[PDB]
Amino acid sequence: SYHLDTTAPPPTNLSTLPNNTLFHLWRPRAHILPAEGQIGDPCAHYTDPSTGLFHVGFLHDGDGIAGATTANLATYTDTSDNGSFLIQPGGKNDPVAVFDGAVIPVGVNNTPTLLYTSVSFLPIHWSIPYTRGSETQSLAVARDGGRRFDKLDQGPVIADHPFAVDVTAFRAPFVFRSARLDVLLSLDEEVARNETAVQQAVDGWTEKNAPWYVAVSGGVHGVGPAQFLYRQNGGNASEFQYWEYLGEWWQEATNSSWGDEGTWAGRWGFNFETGNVLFLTEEGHDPQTGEVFVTLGTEGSGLPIVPQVSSIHDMLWAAGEVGVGSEQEGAKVEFSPSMAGFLDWGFSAYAAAGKVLPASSAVSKTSGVEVDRYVSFVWLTGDQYEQADGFPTAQQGWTGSLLLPRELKVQTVENVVDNELVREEGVSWVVGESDNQTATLRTLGITIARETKAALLANGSVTAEEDRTLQTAAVVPFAQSPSSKFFVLTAQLEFPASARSSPLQSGFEILASELERTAIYYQFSNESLVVDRSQTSAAAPTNPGLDSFTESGKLRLFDVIENGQEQVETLDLTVVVDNAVVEVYANGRFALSTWARSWYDNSTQIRFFHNGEGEVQFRNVSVSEGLYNAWPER
Numbered sequence: 001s002y003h004l005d006t007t008a009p010p011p012t013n014l015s016t017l018p019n020n021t022l023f024h025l026w027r028p029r030a031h032i033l034p035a036e037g038q039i040g041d042p043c044a045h046y047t048d049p050s051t052g053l054f055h056v057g058f059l060h061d062g063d064g065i066a067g068a069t070t071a072n073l074a075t076y077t078d079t080s081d082n083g084s085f086l087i088q089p090g091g092k093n094d095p096v097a098v099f100d101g102a103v104i105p106v107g108v109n110n111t112p113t114l115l116y117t118s119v120s121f122l123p124i125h126w127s128i129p130y131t132r133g134s135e136t137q138s139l140a141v142a143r144d145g146g147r148r149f150d151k152l153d154q155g156p157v158i159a160d161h162p163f164a165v166d167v168t169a170f171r172a173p174f175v176f177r178s179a180r181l182d183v184l185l186s187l188d189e190e191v192a193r194n195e196t197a198v199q200q201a202v203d204g205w206t207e208k209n210a211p212w213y214v215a216v217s218g219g220v221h222g223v224g225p226a227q228f229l230y231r232q233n234g235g236n237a238s239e240f241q242y243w244e245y246l247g248e249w250w251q252e253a254t255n256s257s258w259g260d261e262g263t264w265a266g267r268w269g270f271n272f273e274t275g276n277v278l279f280l281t282e283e284g285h286d287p288q289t290g291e292v293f294v295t296l297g298t299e300g301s302g303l304p305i306v307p308q309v310s311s312i313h314d315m316l317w318a319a320g321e322v323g324v325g326s327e328q329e330g331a332k333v334e335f336s337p338s339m340a341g342f343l344d345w346g347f348s349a350y351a352a353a354g355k356v357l358p359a360s361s362a363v364s365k366t367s368g369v370e371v372d373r374y375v376s377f378v379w380l381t382g383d384q385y386e387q388a389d390g391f392p393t394a395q396q397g398w399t400g401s402l403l404l405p406r407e408l409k410v411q412t413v414e415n416v417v418d419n420e421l422v423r424e425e426g427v428s429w430v431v432g433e434s435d436n437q438t439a440t441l442r443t444l445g446i447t448i449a450r451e452t453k454a455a456l457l458a459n460g461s462v463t464a465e466e467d468r469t470l471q472t473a474a475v476v477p478f479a480q481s482p483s484s485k486f487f488v489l490t491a492q493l494e495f496p497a498s499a500r501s502s503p504l505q506s507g508f509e510i511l512a513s514e515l516e517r518t519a520i521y522y523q524f525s526n527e528s529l530v531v532d533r534s535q536t537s538a539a540a541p542t543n544p545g546l547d548s549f550t551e552s553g554k555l556r557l558f559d560v561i562e563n564g565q566e567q568v569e570t571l572d573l574t575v576v577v578d579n580a581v582v583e584v585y586a587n588g589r590f591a592l593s594t595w596a597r598s599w600y601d602n603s604t605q606i607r608f609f610h611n612g613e614g615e616v617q618f619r620n621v622s623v624s625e626g627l628y629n630a631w632p633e634r
Contacts (some may be wrong), residue, residue: 006601010539015390020397026580026597029486030456030627031401032068032076032377034084035634037061038399041274042377044086044114045355046103048146052362054101055079055112055146056084056377058402059354064098065087065116067146073363073375073405074455075632079147087114087149092154093138094118100274100353101174103142104212108240112142114149115214117171118156126168126219126271126299127307135170136160137216139240148549158216158243162228168271169218170228176213176277179205179288184324184333185235185246192324205288211235212470213244217275217296219251225272226251227299229331247331249322255300258318258340258493259426264554266314269298275353278374280319280444283412285356285374291410292335293319293444295343295376297350313350313385315378317343317444319430320411337487341428344378344403345529345553346593351379354408367451375449378403380581380593384547391545401581403593404448404456411445411589417559417566428589438561446591448576456488456576460624465608467619473612475509481605482625485511485579485598489606491621493522493571493616500524500568504614511536511579511596513603518596520584521609522571528552529573529586531594538599546597553592578627 002011004021011017021569030519033039037060044057044065051071056076060066066084078084089098101116122133136156140149142540161170183201184192191197201262211232219225229249232340233242257267274297279290300312318340343352359369382400383391393399393479412432416422418439422431429443448456470476486575493506507521507530530552540546557569574585577596583594606623 006599010599012537013544014392014395014543015393015545017177017392019394022392022395023397025396026595027398028401028578028581030578030630031404031581032056032630033398033401034056034058034060034066035078036133036398037083038382039379039401041100041172041351042353042402043100043274044103044116045353045377046112047356047358047361048112049105051145052365053362054357054361054363059100060085065101065149069146071362072366073357073449073451074628075630077633086147086612087116087140087151089119090587091118091151093136093151094120096120096122097208099135102173102175104175108139108141108152112146113240114140114142114155115173116140117173121307123306124169125310127301127305127309130167130169130221133160137173137214144459150605157241158214158230161218166221167218168221168225169273170216172217172274172444174215174276176215177207177287178208178213178279179210180292180322181213181333182210182235184322194347202288206568207287207429209237209336211237213277215249215275215277217272219271220248222254224252224254224256224592225268225270227272227275227294227296227335229333236289246333249331249333249491250294250335258337261426264426264428265300265316265318265342266312267314269300269314270310271299273297273299274353276352276376278354278408280374280408280410282412284371284409285371291319292322293317293408294335294354295354296406297352310385313347315342315344315346315350315352317341319444320433339428339430339443342553343376343444343446344591344593345551347551348381348384348595349378349403349593350385352376363451370449374408375405376408377405378593380595382595383545388546388547392543403583404576404583405452406591407445407449409445409448411443413441413443413558413589415561416441417561419559421556421558441558443589445588446585447588448574450584455628457624459628460488460626463625465618465621467617467621467624468608469608469615469617470506470608471612471615474608474610476608478606478608478623482623483604484625485577485604486625486627487577488624488627489573489575489577490617490623491573494571494617494619495524495568495571497568499614500617502614503611504616505611506614506616507609509596509607509609510575511603512605512607513600516598516600516603518582518598519609520575521554524614527554527556529555529584529590531582531584531592531596533594533596537597539597547595550625551592551594553590555586555590
């Protein structure tokens with residue numbers, strides 16, 4: 001009889017094993033996921049005014065939204081046992097299912113109010129006809145410290161999609177406040193034109209009494225993906241029953257894409273999902289002075305399209321400006337992208353749900369953060385969006401996880417040589433300023449939420465590696481590698497100008513032993529960070545459910561002036577390995593996450609890697625082992 005032994009070869013068929021046999025094999029310890037079962041889109045996050053506690057939400061087992069709380073954004077506590085659900089389907093407005101939603105901290109009865117998508121019909125997909133009434137938006141109010149959300153005893157507050165518009169989807173409402181939208185909507189049309197009058201109005205705007213806006217995601221059949229915008233009727237902050245439709249504030253033609261060749265920001269695809277609206281500054285979040293950014297998932301597909309199958313799930317972001325709906329009878333305000341990119345380049349990374357985290361929160365007061373931030377939680381589906389080829393789900397006893405909480409802000413890159421690398425059209429950055437010689441770039445900054453990063457390292461064992469240079473091809477083991485699959489790898493790679501045109505590939509191999517290895521390296525040929533998973537798991541060859549295709553993301557290392565000398569920008573890597581959950585971060589503006597399901601206990605070696613093409617200098621390489629327990633009470 002077989003009893004799990006990960007020092008021995010994996011059985012040929014993992015799906016024949018007893019239930020829960022693989023429960024701990026690839027399970028993380030410092031990530032957000034339910035006690036068991038599967039996790040879907042994260043959503044419904046909010047800072048509770050009264051307690052200052054940050055509440056996290058997420059779809060769980062396709063049967064509603066579950067939650068947890070945190071007082072430090074380092075450890076979490078389930079709202080309750082038996083799934084820890086907050087709201088489930090079975091009501092009059094959501095007889096079939098409960099989809100994504102967002103929370104207004106001070107709403108009905110002056111308590112946390114959830115505005116969510118109540119579902120009454122299935123199936124629902126952009127590639128098939130939409131059934132009228134499938135998705136509506138309903139209200140629920142928090143009870144017992146947010147440990148539960150009671151549905152208001154009435155029908156949906158937005159009971160239908162825009163009149164006569166053939167939507168592909170109409171879900172995932174996201175609430176937010178905005179000085180600029182308030183200004184644009186109040187000012188006379190021809191006045192709301194000149195930026196001068198507008199900005200003056202914004203300066204005196206006050207958040208506390210401003211109305212709530214709602215962005216619902218979807219698209220329109222035969223036209224393309226879009227975001228539907230609404231706001232408390234008449235701009236009345238006390239109006240929660242009626243939401244006036246402001247139009248399709250952002251739409252893109254079917255499967256079009258940012259830039260001419262769909263290079264830096266995938267494609268807009270056929271439908272927009274889980275849209276988030278943010279207002280960022282170079283320090284964090286501010287709805288008065290922050291620039292408009294939007295994160296969203298886009299559903300894509302090759303041709304011929306296979307109905308009810310989205311082959312591509314891109315986790316994108318866009319930054320831009322908002323203006324009045326011009327000279328038309330269309331949207332009252334429109335979002336115009338100026339730059340776009342990926343929040344996470346991972347194939348399985350998607351449906352990010354974030355929220356403002358007030359400096360007044362219990363979390364920020366404890367860590368001493370004096371500014372408001374925007375923390376975003378990205379989803380990492382556990383089974384390729386339910387398209388996996390027989391993953392041993394019953395054996396694992398759980399599916400999926402959220403990625404580490406991430407701080408989003410405006411990140412600047414200074415001292416960049418103003419050349420073609422900077423001027424390419426359709427990129428993920430804008431030129432903040434330049435004298436035709438050097439410039440300052442502006443892009444989306446992505447970092448692990450500081451408290452979480454602090455916790456990941458607090459009690460870790462630190463082991464540094466000697467700076468090293470590699471010219472000839474080589475795979476060099478570290479002096480000492482971790483003995484577990486829980487660690488944080490840090491390193492800086494410096495490349496010579498000559499490496500740009502070379503077939504150079506430089507990085508590290510991790511989770512390695514004789515029969516397994518995972519490679520992570522930078523590649524100039526297509527300026528990408530790559531995670532080669534072709535040899536990650538000894539169990540993959542006979543278990544197709546364990547995807548092993550290559551993951552990768554574009555990362556351009558600009559020419560910069562550092563010490564009076566021009567050099568290729570330094571690749572600053574941070575790789576967090578929480579068992580099978582791998583997250584590759586780079587230069588505070590890049591994230592690529594995936595599943596590295598290695599089998600053997602011994603596959604913990606780490607090695608320097610260089611393909612002999614070009615040259616590379618490794619510096620400040622170090623490993624922190626151990627991470628921490630994100631769920632102390634479980």
